[PDB]
Amino acid sequence: VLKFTTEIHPSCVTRQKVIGAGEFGEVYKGMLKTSSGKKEVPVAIKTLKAGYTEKQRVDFLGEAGIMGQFSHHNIIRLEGVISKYKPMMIITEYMENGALDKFLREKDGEFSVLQLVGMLRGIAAGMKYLANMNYVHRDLAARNILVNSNLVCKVSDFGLSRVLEDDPEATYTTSGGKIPIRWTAPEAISYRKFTSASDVWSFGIVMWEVMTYGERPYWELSNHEVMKAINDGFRLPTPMDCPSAIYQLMMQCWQQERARRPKFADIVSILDKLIRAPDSLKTLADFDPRVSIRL
Ligand SMILES: Cc1cccc(Cl)c1NC(=O)c1cnc(Nc2cc(C(=O)NC3CCNCC3)cc(-c3ccccc3N)c2)s1
């Protein structure tokens, strides 16, 4: 028995603005009337346009069904679905600052170290919750994390191919594409061994995305060049202005041997201890001089 997913009546949903457009549906900002007409809240609304295939329907509704099993501050909240009327819709809370990667790239250098570390603690708490629920995300990356007005970060992007046994799409993105290599642990790339410990590798890459304000991991390297570097033992260098303890933690997430990586519980605990003793964050890792400027 799974937690009940609310079927929403279309009369309770208004769409105010298109915010995203795909080939197979759109995403809107809107309002949802709830509590039997007594409350109204802002929502995001994703549609599935007519002509969708059986696979697209099972995937679309499956994402909502997974989201509906979770109740955590750092996981996107589902309000419900419209499946009985067309276009079908999934309705979630609305995250005012959108995806974390784009948000940081529009906010370069504007946050404190403590704020960035706090964002990572929230993401880590959401991932701890997911891993404890026996959910392996497989595509953890800043692009799949949303940010609200209050800077709370929440994990998004769920799918049935992550939960069903021997699923033939388990190694693809939720859109059927190739999962971007540069967030993925070596044993998941080479053997398809996706587990919470490969999600810990990905979380280390997310830490580096956050501390760099959304830089592209490995910069211009191609996918094969990233695989070359990782398998030689190369790891991403420290971000600028990054606490030594934070860079050490991301390096531990990138241990080749998956059993040596921290668990999500370890990550949350370490981040909490650093935030509560903030002088621990003033020791910075050396930023490796990339350019020589002499005068
Ligand atoms: C509805 C739904 C169904 C299934 C799965 C999920 Cl996770 C969801 N929920 C959502 O997608 C979303 C919840 N909140 C969101 N916030 C959001 C917010 C905004 C938006 O208003 N962003 C601000 C606009 C001004 N710049 C600062 C960001 C834009 C998007 C967005 C959506 C599609 C393509 C590009 C975009 N930039 C998204 S999207």
Side-chain angles (χ1 to χ4, degrees):
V1 187
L2 301 174
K3 320 308 165 144
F4 174 69
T5 294
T6 297
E7 177 76 22
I8 293 174
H9 194 264
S11 64
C12 292
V13 179
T14 60
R15 283 178 285 176
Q16 298 162 303
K17 176 175 60 172
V18 192
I19 64 185
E23 183 178 2
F24 310 117
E26 303 84 39
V27 183
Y28 302 79
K29 162 70 177 59
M31 299 293 298
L32 175 68
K33 179 164 63 166
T34 195
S35 312
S36 304
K38 301 184 311 216
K39 309 288 166 179
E40 197 164 36
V41 295
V43 289
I45 300 153
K46 189 182 158 195
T47 62
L48 189 62
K49 283 151 43 207
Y52 55 84
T53 63
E54 181 179 14
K55 155 177 173 53
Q56 285 172 321
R57 175 261 290 172
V58 178
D59 294 349
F60 182 82
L61 298 178
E63 175 174 35
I66 290 166
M67 284 190 32
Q69 305 310 303
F70 303 144
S71 183
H72 190 273
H73 174 63
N74 299 101
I75 300 288
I76 185 73
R77 191 177 69 256
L78 174 71
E79 295 284 357
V81 306
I82 302 185
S83 66
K84 291 184 134 221
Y85 302 88
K86 306 303 183 286
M88 293 198 312
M89 295 178 172
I90 300 167
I91 303 180
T92 70
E93 69 183 309
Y94 178 68
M95 301 291 282
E96 298 89 342
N97 286 309
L100 177 57
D101 62 339
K102 193 157 183 284
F103 182 61
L104 293 181
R105 291 166 194 154
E106 301 175 9
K107 303 290 182 186
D108 187 89
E110 290 178 37
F111 297 124
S112 68
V113 169
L114 268 168
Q115 285 180 302
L116 300 169
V117 177
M119 290 174 183
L120 292 168
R121 192 271 186 204
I123 300 161
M127 287 306 307
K128 182 187 179 178
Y129 178 90
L130 287 180
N132 285 348
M133 306 280 298
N134 200 23
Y135 189 81
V136 178
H137 189 287
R138 305 199 185 212
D139 197 16
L140 175 62
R143 65 182 168 272
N144 288 327
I145 297 171
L146 293 169
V147 185
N148 72 13
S149 290
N150 284 1
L151 305 179
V152 176
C153 292
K154 304 187 187 206
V155 181
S156 317
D157 187 58
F158 305 104
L160 285 173
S161 69
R162 285 76 177 95
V163 300
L164 296 179
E165 293 177 350
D166 294 322
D167 194 283
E169 304 171 354
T171 66
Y172 304 131
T173 64
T174 55
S175 189
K178 303 172 168 310
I179 301 177
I181 286 319
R182 67 193 61 220
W183 284 261
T184 303
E187 73 277 3
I189 291 171
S190 296
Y191 306 113
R192 293 182 183 174
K193 287 196 271 243
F194 289 82
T195 66
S196 295
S198 62
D199 282 349
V200 164
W201 181 289
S202 307
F203 180 81
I205 306 294
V206 172
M207 294 178 69
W208 192 92
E209 295 184 277
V210 169
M211 302 309 297
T212 62
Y213 292 87
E215 278 204 74
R216 175 165 178 81
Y218 311 92
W219 299 280
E220 72 279 6
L221 287 197
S222 69
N223 284 347
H224 290 159
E225 286 165 344
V226 173
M227 295 175 197
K228 178 167 62 180
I230 289 303
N231 292 332
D232 272 351
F234 170 87
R235 299 292 189 265
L236 290 165
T238 185
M240 298 184 35
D241 306 318
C242 186
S244 179
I246 295 296
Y247 187 59
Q248 291 177 55
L249 179 58
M250 66 182 84
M251 284 292 298
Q252 290 300 318
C253 295
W254 306 325
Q255 289 256 38
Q256 168 69 30
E257 293 177 350
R258 72 174 205 198
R260 295 179 65 175
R261 295 176 199 149
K263 313 302 184 191
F264 279 113
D266 302 315
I267 294 169
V268 172
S269 171
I270 296 154
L271 294 175
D272 274 346
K273 292 186 165 64
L274 295 167
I275 292 164
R276 293 182 183 174
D279 273 6
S280 69
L281 296 167
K282 291 179 174 177
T283 302
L284 304 179
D286 185 47
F287 178 75
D288 199 41
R290 294 245 330 133
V291 277
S292 181
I293 293 293
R294 333 170 325 263
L295 302 149

